[PDB]
Design a protein around this nucleic acid. Structure first.
Ligand SMILES: [Mg+2]
Ligand SMILES: [Mg+2]
Ligand SMILES: [Mg+2]
Ligand SMILES: [Mg+2]
Ligand SMILES: [Mg+2]
Ligand SMILES: [Mg+2]
Ligand SMILES: [Mg+2]
Ligand SMILES: [Mg+2]
Ligand SMILES: [Mg+2]
Ligand SMILES: [Mg+2]
Ligand SMILES: [Mg+2]
Ligand SMILES: [Mg+2]
Ligand SMILES: [Mg+2]
Ligand SMILES: [Mg+2]
Ligand SMILES: [Mg+2]
Ligand SMILES: [Mg+2]
Ligand SMILES: [Mg+2]
Ligand SMILES: [Mg+2]
Ligand SMILES: [Mg+2]
Ligand SMILES: [Mg+2]
Ligand SMILES: [Mg+2]
Ligand SMILES: [Mg+2]
Ligand SMILES: [Mg+2]
Ligand SMILES: [Mg+2]
Ligand SMILES: [Mg+2]
Ligand SMILES: [Mg+2]
Ligand SMILES: [Mg+2]
Ligand SMILES: [Mg+2]
Ligand SMILES: [Mg+2]
Ligand SMILES: [Mg+2]
Ligand SMILES: [Mg+2]
Ligand SMILES: [Mg+2]
Ligand SMILES: [Mg+2]
Ligand SMILES: [Mg+2]
Ligand SMILES: [Mg+2]
Ligand SMILES: [Mg+2]
Ligand SMILES: [Mg+2]
Ligand SMILES: [Mg+2]
Ligand SMILES: [Mg+2]
Ligand SMILES: [Mg+2]
Ligand SMILES: [Mg+2]
Ligand SMILES: [Mg+2]
Ligand SMILES: [Mg+2]
Ligand SMILES: [Mg+2]
Lengths: 96, 61, 50, 102
RNA sequence: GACUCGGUGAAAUCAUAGUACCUGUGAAGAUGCAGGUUACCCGCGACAGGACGGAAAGACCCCGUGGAGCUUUACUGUAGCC
RNA sequence: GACAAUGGUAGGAGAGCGUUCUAAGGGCGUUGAAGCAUGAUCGUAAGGACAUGUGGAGCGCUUAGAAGUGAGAAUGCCGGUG
RNA sequence: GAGGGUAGCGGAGAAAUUCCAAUCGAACCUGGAGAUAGCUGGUUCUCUCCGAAAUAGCUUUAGGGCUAGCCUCAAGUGAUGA
RNA sequence: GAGCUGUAAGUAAGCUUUGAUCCAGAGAUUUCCGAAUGGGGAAACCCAGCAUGAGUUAUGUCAUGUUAUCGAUAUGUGAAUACAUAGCAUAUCAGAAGGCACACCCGGAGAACUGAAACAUCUUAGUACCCGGAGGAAGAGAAAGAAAAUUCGAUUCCCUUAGUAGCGGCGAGCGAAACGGGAAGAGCCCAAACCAACAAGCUUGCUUGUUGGGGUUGUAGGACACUCUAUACGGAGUUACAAAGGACGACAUUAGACGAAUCAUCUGGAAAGAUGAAUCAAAGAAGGUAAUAAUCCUGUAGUCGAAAAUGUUGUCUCUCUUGAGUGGAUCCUGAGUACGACGGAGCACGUGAAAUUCCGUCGGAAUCUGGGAGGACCAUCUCCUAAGGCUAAAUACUCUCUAGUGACCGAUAGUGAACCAGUACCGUGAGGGAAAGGUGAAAAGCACCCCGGAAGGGGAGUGAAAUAGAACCUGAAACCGUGUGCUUACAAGUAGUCAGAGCCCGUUAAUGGGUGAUGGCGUGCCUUUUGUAGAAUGAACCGGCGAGUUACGAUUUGAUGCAAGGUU
């Protein structure tokens, strides 16, 4: 309340909407993938069990922050272009 | 204590609403009509709603 | 180690003596006591748990 | 009460501690007893009452029953009392000698 | 009636009070502050100038986005009537 | 050892006093507890002892915990008494 | 005079806002209920350090409030202050 | 198992071991009013009828039973009006009524102050109040569900989702649900098709109605046809699924019984305290006892116990009862319903793009190749199968009883009420509504003397104490008195403070205490104010009581644990 001056949150306008079908992904970066032994088959179940991912949300997306230092076969619902490139370049493989 | 002898159709309560949405209590009364029908095998003048009378489903005698 | 009826009943009326099990250990009882007398089985159970 | 009219009792607490006497009345609702020669009170008696002669009358006042103890029939020592059942009748037993009291 | 004596015996009020006047000072009209002036201690009958005396959280005045009763071609409604 | 600061209303910050209850430890008490009363006692303050009288059965102390925790004012409420 | 009737969004009035159980512009009791009170009053131990404001802007706002300004506590920067 | 005739003392008369009083189960009696019911009535009263009986020569009088209204079921009678229908009369009914636990549940009807810094939509709130209906719980409930996968499988309730999605003068504010995690779990019966019997219309065609059978659904089910299976073998049951019992047993409740172990001295009125030496402990819970007791009493741990009534249960008995599959020709599967329009309401959702659901009014389907839903609507797909009913548990609450608990009160507190309190008192009434606890261990409650009419007192005595003597533990302050050390009748006082002789004392023994001739200085406190000695406000005085709390969220700081994890 501002003593009768039109309050801020009435002088400013509303914006936007919320998407009913909004999707959000549990994200995993390459630096986090670095904990699995080279040759590992990283899957959503393995990520959850290992505790890298707690809440899977709409699925696992791999992102490219940090450096991958291991060869892995990564199964996830989505990949950043950079994440897929790093996984392949380290000799590993990725699949959606 | 006024209702349709056949169906129990009775008055209800609700609001009269103005254009400014002011509210005042009002009633919706049944469209009751005093008719002579057969009650326990004998003629009797009872209150019957028009809807209960519709399509000759009640015998007036 | 577990509920020992005869030990409980023999110690119950002695002022200053409290009886518990390995699972029943709690900070107030331990701290109030001056000495702990624990059977070997109970000690092993406590060691496992903690 | 464990003490009974006619019992011979020893006073174990009070001014008369150590005295022995006969229980000549009990007050169950007060847990009290009257013992001969014990707890003597000097009451001011008006001669003007229904008794012509008056003055200072000396009589026993009741004492709390937990202040008297039964005397063992054999050893004559103060004793607590237990109960036995002999042919379906309760018998008071001195806990020191085991003998029946009355 | 008041007054004196015997009997009986309230009340409003009240921060503590050993409670003068004048001219001044000061929240601008002082028993209580300054400077003077006057005044031995304690009653009783009386008078009402002051204690901005008591009594009632001013009723006049204004204020509160207070209340209530009242009016109407204020607004919005509504019983009822057509 | 030196030398610097220390008026203060609203208000912010800090350290403490005292009250009742609880826990644990350690004590006191009919050879007289608490309460009350008096005194020329001690601490920088809130406050803490001691002695004596009264009183007649309960109460300190230490550390921690918890609060119906401190009154001088509300034309405050109740009582007592002017 | 006696026995009765009319009841509060209501009665009654040869009409005064007049009466309805000693105050009627809407009786009395209980409840919603601690209505609401931007108003007045009140708000209880101690010491130590710092210490304002009575302005601007906007406000159905003007003895209210919000943000800024001025106080305080803490952390940070580091000479940027006088 | 020895005393007893309540509070409640006294006196009197009595009772009780031939078992009182007292405690528990069962039974008897149980005036009058009150729903109050024979009628009336200003409740606790008055006045009757009828039958039977008592009494009187008879009347008068009395006793017992019975006589309200409505409802239901029978019987008789029966108007206008013929038939019989109102009506009327009689009989039966453990039929209803009224009360309340200021609670919880369901429903009818339904505010306002208030918030929105005004106010109308909105909020307060479907709350308060009123009314109806319950039940021990109620409500809900076996998908015309939730959804969108590897789908789930009645209802209710808790956690979470989440102050999210949304609603909203898009203001104040209002505010889900599904999923996931849990408590608890249980499923059933009709309507219809069709069949058999009975009755009316008498096609005496076969239509209608009643009874019984049959049947119960989405994986569509059933009828119907056929094939197996059984006449209670099995299965089920009075908590739904049909509804009454009986026998025996167990356990529990309603009285009770046993139940270990301490002596001495000191102090003291009294020992449980202190001291010394012992003892029990499945008992060191607690209360009492002349002060503070494991061992004195009542008890506690432990063990035992029921003539009788009640409750919960088990087994027998009893009762009831067929259970599956195949076929797709025909038949059935809830109508003035679903649904629509208009007006309202309810859904977190304020009419909105408004699904989903109810009410009034009017209109008004389809029939398994059907119908409903997936938030307007259509298509497709998917999930369901309305318009009939029942159903335990998990959930809510506490007038009450039993056993317990509390860093809850301790007589201005705690209930309004510790006490003869919803009393006294106030009011026509609804209604409002107090104050008031404590002798002592024991009543031993002051024999006797003295002054006084008494009250009251002084002795004496009881008692540890009367200086505990009756609202009698302690006994503060205001206030009122008596005595007195210092002081005061030439003085102008917010009463003190600083200086100071004189006089009187002598302490927590301190460079003391009381008083104060005289000098300097000095206009209370609080509140509120630019500023108050203020002649602005408040307080007569003293005492007690009397105001930032708690819950749940948010944020920040300190603390601590763990850390790319942390936490339930
Ligand atoms: Mg005269
Ligand atoms: Mg006189
Ligand atoms: Mg003043
Ligand atoms: Mg001037
Ligand atoms: Mg002067
Ligand atoms: Mg005046
Ligand atoms: Mg005024
Ligand atoms: Mg300072
Ligand atoms: Mg200075
Ligand atoms: Mg502070
Ligand atoms: Mg307080
Ligand atoms: Mg008149
Ligand atoms: Mg006028
Ligand atoms: Mg009048
Ligand atoms: Mg309210
Ligand atoms: Mg108020
Ligand atoms: Mg300063
Ligand atoms: Mg404006
Ligand atoms: Mg009658
Ligand atoms: Mg408003
Ligand atoms: Mg307002
Ligand atoms: Mg139900
Ligand atoms: Mg607008
Ligand atoms: Mg399906
Ligand atoms: Mg049944
Ligand atoms: Mg015993
Ligand atoms: Mg014993
Ligand atoms: Mg002894
Ligand atoms: Mg509509
Ligand atoms: Mg739809
Ligand atoms: Mg629809
Ligand atoms: Mg859709
Ligand atoms: Mg249930
Ligand atoms: Mg007291
Ligand atoms: Mg009280
Ligand atoms: Mg009271
Ligand atoms: Mg006294
Ligand atoms: Mg002189
Ligand atoms: Mg100021
Ligand atoms: Mg002014
Ligand atoms: Mg003055
Ligand atoms: Mg004022
Ligand atoms: Mg005043
Ligand atoms: Mg006071």
């Amino acid at each position: 309340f501002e003593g009768g001056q039109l309050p801020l949150f009435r002088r400013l306008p509303k914006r936007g909407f919320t998407n009913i079908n909004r999707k959000e992904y549990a994200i995993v970066n390459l630096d986090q993938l670095n904990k699995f032994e080279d040759g590992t088959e990283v899957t959503p179940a393995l990520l959850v069990e290992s505790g890298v991912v707690k809440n899977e949300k709409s699925g696992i997306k791999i992102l490219g922050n940090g450096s991958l230092d291991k060869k892995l076969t990564v199964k996830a619902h989505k990949f950043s272009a950079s994440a897929a490139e790093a996984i392949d370049a380290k000799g590993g493989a990725h699949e959606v | 204590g006024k209702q349709c002898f056949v169906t129990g159709r009775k008055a209800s309560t609700g609001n009269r609403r103005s254009h400014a949405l002011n509210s005042t209590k009002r009633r919706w009364n049944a469209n009751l009509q005093k008719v002579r029908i057969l009650v326990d095998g004998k003629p009797k003048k009872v209150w019957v709603s028009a809807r209960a009378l519709k399509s000759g489903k009640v015998t007036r005698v | 180690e577990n509920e020992d009826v005869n030990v409980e009943l023999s110690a119950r009326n002695i002022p200053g003596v409290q009886v518990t099990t390995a699972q029943g250990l709690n900070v107030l009882d331990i701290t109030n006591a001056d000495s702990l007398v624990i059977t070997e089985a109970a000690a092993k159970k406590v060691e496992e748990v903690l | 009460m464990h003490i009974k009219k006619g019992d011979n009792v020893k006073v174990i607490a009070g001014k008369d501690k150590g005295k022995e006497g006969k229980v000549i009345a009990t007050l169950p609702k007060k847990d009290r007893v009257v013992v001969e020669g014990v707890n003597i009170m000097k009451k001011h008696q008006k001669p003007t009452q229904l008794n012509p002669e008056g003055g200072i009358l000396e009589t026993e006042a009741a004492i709390h029953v937990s202040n008297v103890q039964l005397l063992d029939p054999k050893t004559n020592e103060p004793t607590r009392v237990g109960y036995k059942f002999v042919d379906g009748k309760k018998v008071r037993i001195a806990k020191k000698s085991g003998e029946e009291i009355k």
